[PDB]
Design a protein around this nucleic acid. Structure first.
Ligand SMILES: [Mg+2]
Ligand SMILES: [Mg+2]
Ligand SMILES: [Mg+2]
Ligand SMILES: [Mg+2]
Ligand SMILES: [Mg+2]
Ligand SMILES: [Mg+2]
Ligand SMILES: [Mg+2]
Ligand SMILES: [Mg+2]
Ligand SMILES: [Mg+2]
Ligand SMILES: [Mg+2]
Ligand SMILES: [Mg+2]
Ligand SMILES: [Mg+2]
Ligand SMILES: [Mg+2]
Ligand SMILES: [Mg+2]
Ligand SMILES: [Mg+2]
Ligand SMILES: [Mg+2]
Ligand SMILES: [Mg+2]
Ligand SMILES: [Mg+2]
Ligand SMILES: [Mg+2]
Ligand SMILES: [Mg+2]
Ligand SMILES: [Mg+2]
Ligand SMILES: [Mg+2]
Lengths: 53, 56, 147, 52, 125, 187, 128
RNA sequence: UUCAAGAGGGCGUGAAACCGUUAAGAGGUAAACGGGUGGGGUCCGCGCAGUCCGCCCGGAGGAUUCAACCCGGCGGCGGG
RNA sequence: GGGGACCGUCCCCCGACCGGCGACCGGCCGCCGCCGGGCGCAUUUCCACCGCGGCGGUGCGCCGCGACCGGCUCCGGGACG
RNA sequence: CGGCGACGUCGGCUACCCACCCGACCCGUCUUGAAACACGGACCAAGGAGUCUAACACGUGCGCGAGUCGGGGGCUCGCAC
RNA sequence: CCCCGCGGACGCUACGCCGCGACGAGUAGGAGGGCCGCUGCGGUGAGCCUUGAAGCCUAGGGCGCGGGCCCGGGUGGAGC
């Protein structure tokens, strides 16, 4: 099946398929300081329905 | 005209309509006018920041 | 998969999606391209103009091999040789130009769409167009005919 | 009998599926999620000598 | 990756039980035994499991070591805590909080340990 | 009763990819967070294109990408395409390009890398520019498809130049009546 | 005595009777299983007054008490002791119950283990 | 006899329509049906002195007895 | 036709500089945690029992009553301009 | 905050029977219009009707991508699969 | 530089969870969802079963808006 550096030597045209996402560690990506620097602060307060008095 | 009844409201009618049944169209939603902050946030650029300003 | 189709969702609906008034009958309108000039004329005229009638000269015993002449444009001329052929000629000090035999690559006629890189090349072909020859001579190349 | 029982799949897609299957068979979470009782297996790309 | 492996087993797993509008996951190191990304005990580089002791007294706290992820024979370190209920919960709390080892599972492991120890004391007639 | 109409209540748009590709779904998870938690409209455009179908994500040739990146003031910018980057064999010289694509053809990738260029996936682009700063968001030709030649006014109407559906092309196939004044009419 | 649920809210059922099929009273060949009427003149489909009512989404149960037994629990069908263990951390909200095909010898062990784990069984004295 | 004839030579199981008998209820607007109650009945509820468990206080008891130290094992994190 | 040279990729090496020890791993240390064994043998720690004990949560086997608060609503008195 | 609690009572009922008040014409179908003095339907069981092939068109998913596709053939212990 | 307390609920199947607002007739017809249902195949449940499978019966207990489903009792006797 070959490497990504070299094609397969027993299939004459085949090479390993490529990744459309190199780093699948989603938690590492989201927690990275460059991602965290660009984010606005979370809006974690729940605003429930106000009973109109 | 066959479909409506209309007339000239007085001051008391305007007060009681806004105070009891007054709802604002805030972000296309029907939100009860429970706080002045709801009015001031959408109409404050016109100088209207309270229920009194809206009634006036 | 028959489980993904409308027939599974039409169980319990009496008409099976074909209506109560007009129903699903055998062949209302005819079979195949029936009535293409009488009661399907609007459809045939609207979507298939030119459908009826003869045009041109008929030719018995057409042999498609006689008129076999695949064509290649100038913008793809340098793909018929290796990139090494190209880069060696570009950095060549002398005036030596590589030969591209399009007949070897499977084309007979060289058309002139696109532009050529500015370096001479000898092009062998059965046929050339006027503008293809003009552009080849513009980059300093030559057109040579083969049979 | 002429129901088109057979399907043809592109060679590149069949090669793709082999690569995905081999890659997944190197992860303990995926193999255990098949239910293969690999708990005392010393190493999951498990390779033995040629004497076998 | 944990997220990549989750996208493979989130709906296709031998531990997956979908029944009675409920979903459970029965792999060994799943506290709360639920099919969730956080509680899955196979896809993470560090997992916590609490099981009853083999002899029927105490708990076994199993944690996943960091190095040999692809070597399942040595990947899990098991210890047996067979002391009183309060000190057993303290040991599990210190294992998770002090080590910074997967602190989102601290109360899940404590509650599971309490359930195990309560099931080991004699039943009531 | 309320005097309203309900035939346009449900907006028809992709809220998620119809694909089951788990790698596409993971970086949809990434850019769904980026669009929500930043004020960048670049993330919103990228996220909605990740949902899009393949016909709505046409391939982008190397020549078109080179041409759009050669416009003034676009140097040292990352060309981002939500789709495939395709080699064009009609271009002879490839400049130094920094590109982020969903897919890159093997030969296009080799040409870009030989030129000294850089290829990023969409998760690497998120790390390199979470707000999408310094990017040229490009698209392939949306209407560069054979179906669009048949779309439009019907072929049998005046001033319409839309291709008809014919099984074969030749002098015997839809060329006589309604196509020339010598056979009935032309329009 | 019996194991109590975590919370026991009042369960409100919008309808208690069953939706019987139209004209299932008049015939034996028509089972009471609900079928949507689709006749052109069908007065049940047209919703005339005093007729058989049709199920619609407005009868849906409160999502807080949906699928909840009168005891306040929610059942989970188990087949052996291993499937009983998954309710260890759902003691106060879910109750196990043993499948009909489980033998009497094996459902003894399920009941004994459930008593150890404080899991409520809806049919504990079922084959004895 | 058989495990079983509530398997008895067209005999595995044995539905519905329909019929006999027994039990309960009812009956002059043909029956049947939807909604709402009421009465009776058959069952169900380990119903019949009514949950449970966390901390604290007091009482009287037991104990591989606790913290801190030492030895060993194993982990987690960090190290130009 | 062979044999060469050249170019492009590769696969191993002989070495150094650069970014990292990482989600590729070991040894040393440093901190921390757990376990086992000693020691600690009693104002500590734990175990179970009792009080119609208190503070929390949940909930009363069944049938019921009351109170105040708030929302909506229909009414009734009294007074002012 | 009150009362009540085992061989009589407590709670339950979707479900069994009965009574009463209000509402309620027999379904299917064609039809502008069916309860129709329009047709089919005595009852029950089992069976019973948009399928497959080919060819187009558009949409959608997948792989590769100026290419793509071995489908016919051949090579691989000829053969449990 | 938190430390007499070394401690502090739940959560987030992200195809998940949460909030707010408006809305809800429907033949022919279209679309979506179905942890609705039947049969068979590949996987999986260290699944169930002669201490009793399928099927059938049932004034038995329930769940779901519904399609339907689960459980108790009886019969049955080998598969689901
Ligand atoms: Mg319809
Ligand atoms: Mg019908
Ligand atoms: Mg007609
Ligand atoms: Mg005519
Ligand atoms: Mg409508
Ligand atoms: Mg119901
Ligand atoms: Mg019936
Ligand atoms: Mg009508
Ligand atoms: Mg028998
Ligand atoms: Mg018989
Ligand atoms: Mg009888
Ligand atoms: Mg008719
Ligand atoms: Mg008529
Ligand atoms: Mg009718
Ligand atoms: Mg009449
Ligand atoms: Mg007649
Ligand atoms: Mg007729
Ligand atoms: Mg008749
Ligand atoms: Mg008949
Ligand atoms: Mg049938
Ligand atoms: Mg409405
Ligand atoms: Mg509707």
């Amino acid at each position: 099946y070959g490497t990504w550096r070299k094609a397969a030597s027993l299939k004459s045209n085949y090479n390993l398929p490529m990744h459309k996402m190199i780093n699948t560690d989603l938690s590492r990506i989201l927690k990275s300081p460059e991602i965290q620097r660009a984010l606005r602060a979370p809006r974690k307060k729940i605003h429930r329905r106000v009973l109109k008095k | 005209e066959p479909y409506i009844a209309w007339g000239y409201p007085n001051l008391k009618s305007v007060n009681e309509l806004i105070y009891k049944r007054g709802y604002g169209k805030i972000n296309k939603k029907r939100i009860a006018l429970t706080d002045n902050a709801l009015i001031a946030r959408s109409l404050g650029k016109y100088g209207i920041i309270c229920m009194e300003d809206l009634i006036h | 998969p028959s489980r993904l189709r409308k027939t599974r969702k039409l169980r319990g609906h009496v008409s099976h999606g074909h209506g109560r008034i007009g129903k699903h009958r055998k062949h209302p309108g005819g079979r195949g391209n029936a009535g293409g000039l009488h009661h399907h004329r609007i459809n045939f005229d609207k979507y298939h103009p030119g459908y009826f009638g003869k045009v041109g000269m008929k030719h018995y015993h057409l042999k498609r091999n006689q008129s076999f002449c695949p064509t290649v444009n100038l913008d793809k001329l340098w793909t018929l040789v290796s990139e090494q052929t190209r880069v060696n000629a570009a950095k060549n000090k002398t005036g030596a130009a590589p030969i591209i035999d399009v007949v070897r690559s499977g084309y007979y006629k060289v058309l002139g769409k696109g532009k050529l890189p500015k370096q001479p090349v000898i092009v062998k072909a059965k046929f050339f167009s006027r503008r293809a020859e003009e552009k080849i001579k513009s980059v300093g190349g030559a057109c040579v005919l083969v049979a | 009998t002429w129901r088109r029982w057979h399907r043809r799949v592109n060679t590149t897609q069949k090669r793709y599926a082999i690569c995905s299957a081999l890659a997944a068979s190197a992860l303990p979470a995926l193999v255990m999620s098949k239910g293969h009782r690999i708990e005392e297996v010393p190493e999951l790309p498990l390779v033995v000598e040629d004497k076998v | 990756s944990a997220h990549l492996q989750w996208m493979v087993v989130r709906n296709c797993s031998s531990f997956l039980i979908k029944r009675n509008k409920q979903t459970y996951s029965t792999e060994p190191n799943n506290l709360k035994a639920r099919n969730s990304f956080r509680y899955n005990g196979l896809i993470h580089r560090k997992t916590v499991g609490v099981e009853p002791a083999a002899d029927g007294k105490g708990v076994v706290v199993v944690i996943k070591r960091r190095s040999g992820q692809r070597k399942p024979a040595t990947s899990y370190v098991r210890t047996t805590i067979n002391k009183n209920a309060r000190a057993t919960l303290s040991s599990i709390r210190h294992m998770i909080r002090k080590n910074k080892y997967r602190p989102d599972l601290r109360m899940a492991a404590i509650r599971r340990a309490s359930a195990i120890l309560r099931s080991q004391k004699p039943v009531m007639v | 009763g309320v005097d309203i109409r309900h035939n346009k209540d449900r907006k028809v748009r992709r809220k998620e990819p119809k694909s089951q590709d788990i790698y596409l779904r993971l970086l949809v998870k990434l850019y769904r967070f980026l669009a929500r938690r930043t004020n960048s409209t670049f993330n919103q455009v990228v996220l909605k294109r990740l949902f899009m179908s393949r016909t709505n994500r046409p391939p982008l040739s190397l020549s078109r990408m080179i041409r759009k990146m050669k416009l003034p003031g676009r140097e040292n910018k990352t060309a981002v395409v939500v789709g495939t980057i395709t080699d064009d064999v009609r271009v002879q010289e490839v400049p130094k390009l920094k590109v982020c694509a969903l897919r890159v053809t093997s030969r296009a990738r080799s040409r870009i890398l030989r030129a000294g260029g850089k290829i990023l996936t969409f998760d690497q682009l998120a790390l390199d520019s979470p707000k999408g700063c310094g990017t040229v968001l490009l698209s392939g030709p949306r209407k560069g498809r054979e179906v669009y030649r048949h779309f439009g006014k019907a072929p049998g109407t005046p001033h319409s130049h839309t291709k008809p559906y014919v099984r074969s092309k030749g002098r015997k196939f839809e060329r006589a009546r309604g196509r020339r004044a010598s056979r009935g009419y032309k329009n | 005595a019996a194991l109590r649920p975590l919370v026991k809210p009042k369960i409100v059922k919008k309808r208690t009777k069953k939706f019987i099929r139209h004209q299932s009273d008049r015939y034996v060949k028509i089972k009471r299983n609900w079928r949507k009427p689709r006749g052109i003149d069908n007065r049940v489909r047209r919703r005339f007054k005093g007729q058989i009512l049709m199920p619609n989404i407005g009868y849906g149960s409160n999502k807080k008490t949906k699928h909840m037994l009168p005891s306040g629990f929610r059942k989970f069908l188990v087949h052996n002791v291993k499937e009983l263990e998954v309710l260890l951390m759902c003691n106060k909200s879910y109750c196990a119950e043993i499948a009909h095909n489980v033998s009497s010898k094996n459902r003894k062990a399920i009941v004994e283990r459930a008593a150890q784990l404080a899991i409520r069984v809806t049919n504990p004295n079922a084959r004895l």
